[PDB]
Design a protein around this ligand. Sequence first.
Ligand SMILES: Cc1ccc(CCNc2ccccc2)cn1
Ligand SMILES: [Zn+2]
Ligand SMILES: [Zn+2]
Length: 582
Amino acid sequence: NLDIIGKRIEKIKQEHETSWHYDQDHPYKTWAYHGSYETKQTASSMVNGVVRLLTKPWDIIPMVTQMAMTFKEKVDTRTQEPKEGTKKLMKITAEWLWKELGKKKTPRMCTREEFTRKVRSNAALGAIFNKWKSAREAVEDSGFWELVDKERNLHLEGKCETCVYNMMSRAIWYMWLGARFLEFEALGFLNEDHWFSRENSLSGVEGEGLHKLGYILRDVSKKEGGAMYADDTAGWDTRITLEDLKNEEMVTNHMEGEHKKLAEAIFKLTYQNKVVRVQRPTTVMDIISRRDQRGSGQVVTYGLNTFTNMEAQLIRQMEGEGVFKSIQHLTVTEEIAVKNWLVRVGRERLSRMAISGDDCVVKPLDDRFASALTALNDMGKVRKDIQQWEPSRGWNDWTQVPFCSHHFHELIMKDGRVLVVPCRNQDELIGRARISQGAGWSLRETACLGKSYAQMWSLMYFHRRDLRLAANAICSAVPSHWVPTSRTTATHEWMTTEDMLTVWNRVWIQENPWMEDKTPVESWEEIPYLGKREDQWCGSLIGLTSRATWAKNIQTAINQVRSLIGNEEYTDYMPSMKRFRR
Ligand SMILES: Cc1ccc(CCNc2ccccc2)cn1
Ligand SMILES: [Zn+2]
Ligand SMILES: [Zn+2]
C-alpha cells in the first residue's frame, strides 16, 4: 500500500496544494480513493470527405452512417482470489511457458536510440503533451532524459515518483513519455524481438498479418480433434488478477544485471500497484489506486494478454483431458502429472491454438473442452454472452470461426491456386474508412488517409466487388504520387507508393508459404471475387439500383474529388476492371 504509491500521491498533492480535498461523495468502491483537485477539459471522430464522396450508396445505410456519430462500470468491479488448485496450475504453467518462449530468445534492454526512432515515425505509444508540445520534441531535449535518469535511479532504489496513469468496453491509460520509455526499456523486447511470433510461441500470431491468419486457422483445422472454440472474455483487462500479474513478472527470472531490476520495478511499482488520475464532471481529478487489472503500454498489454491467454487455454485444455480432478487442491501426484503433460504434449497443445491478446481459437483434442469450465471461471476469465456453466458452442468449419474481427473464405483462382482471404461485414469496412481521428487535417492529408484505406482494400478485400471498385475509384481520385498516411499505425504492406498489382503478387504469391506455384499474376482480372451470393451475404450492395448507378457513373464521382483537390497528376485505375475496360 502507501509505502509504494504515497510518494507519487504526495508529489501530485503538492502541485495542487491550492485545491486538495478528500471528497466524501467519491463513486469508488473497488478503487482506493486519495483526494481531488481542480481541472477543466474534454476527441470525437470526423468524416473523411474523400472516402464518403466516393461511397455515395452508403450515405443511406444506417450501419455505415451511425458509426461516425457519438464500460467504466466494469472497471469498478472486483475479481475473487482463485482457489489453491487454480493458483498452483497457473504458477506451474506460467513457469513452463516463459521457459519455452525463452529457449530461442534473449531478454534484453531496449535503447533510447530505438525509442527515439519509434517516436520519430508515429507508433501510438500513448504518451501525453505539460512542459513540451509533441513527443517528437521531448526526445531531442536532454533535460527530459535527466528526468528519465532521475526516475530510473529511483526505480533501481525500489521507489517511483512520476509513473502515474491517466484514464480515458475500452479504457486507454496514457502515461507521460518518460514513464513510457522506462516501460519500453524494461519490456519492449517482448514486442521488438517477436516473443509471440507463431514460430517462437506456436499459439501466437504477432507480426503475422491479416493475409496469414486464415491460412493459420486452416492449419489448426487439419489437426485431429473436436470443434473449434472461440470464446471471447467479458472485459478481459478488468479480469486480470494480481495472481496473473505475478505469473507475468516471472519473465524477470530469465533476465540479469540492471535489466532484471528495471523490469522488476516496472512490474512492482507500475503494474502490481497503480496510481491513476480520472476526470469526474461532479470537473475535478480523482487520484485513485489499485493493485490488479491491466494497465500498461497497449503493446506490452498485447504481449502479456497473449501470455496469460495462452496459459488459461492450456489449463482449460488440461481440464478437458482430465489431467486434474478439482481446482480446490492439486495433490502431489497431480502436480507431477500437470508438469508431465506440459513436457510430453505442451508444444503440441500450443500449436492447436491461434491467440492474439484476449482473442483465441482452440481446436482441443475432443469436445470435453466445451464443458471444462471450473478453472476458466475460477481464473476470472468468464465468457461473454453465455451463462457461466452452459457449455461452449464450437464451430465445425474453420471458415465460420471468428478471429481478430474477421472470418476467412477459401477462394480458388481460375488457375486452381488457393487463396485464403480475410473478410468481415462490408458495412464495418466502409464505415471505418469514412472516419478520421484528430483535427487539423489538410485536404491533402485527408486524401492520403483515404488512399491508405483504398490500398488496404485492394490487398486484403480484393474479393469484395464493391471494395475493389471503390478502391480503384479512390486511387483514381487521389494524385498518383501522393503517399498513403495514418496517425495510429500487423504487417501493413499497403503503406507504399509501389504498384498495388506488384505488392499483391509479392504478398499472395511470392512470399506466401502456402502457395507452391510462384507464377506471377499478370493483371487484376486473373484475381477472383467471392461468389455473387456470398458477396451479398457479407454485405455487398450488388443487385441494388443505388449501387448500379454508382458503378455506371463512377468517373463523375472521381472527377468531383479531382476538381476539389485541383490540377494534379492522376491515373485512371478503372480500366483494370473488365466492365470499365471499354
Ligand atoms: C458486377 C455485378 C455482379 C453481379 C450482379 C448481379 C447479382 N445478382 C445476384 C442475385 C442473386 C444472388 C446473388 C447475386 C451485378 N453486377
Ligand atoms: Zn516510476
Ligand atoms: Zn465474408
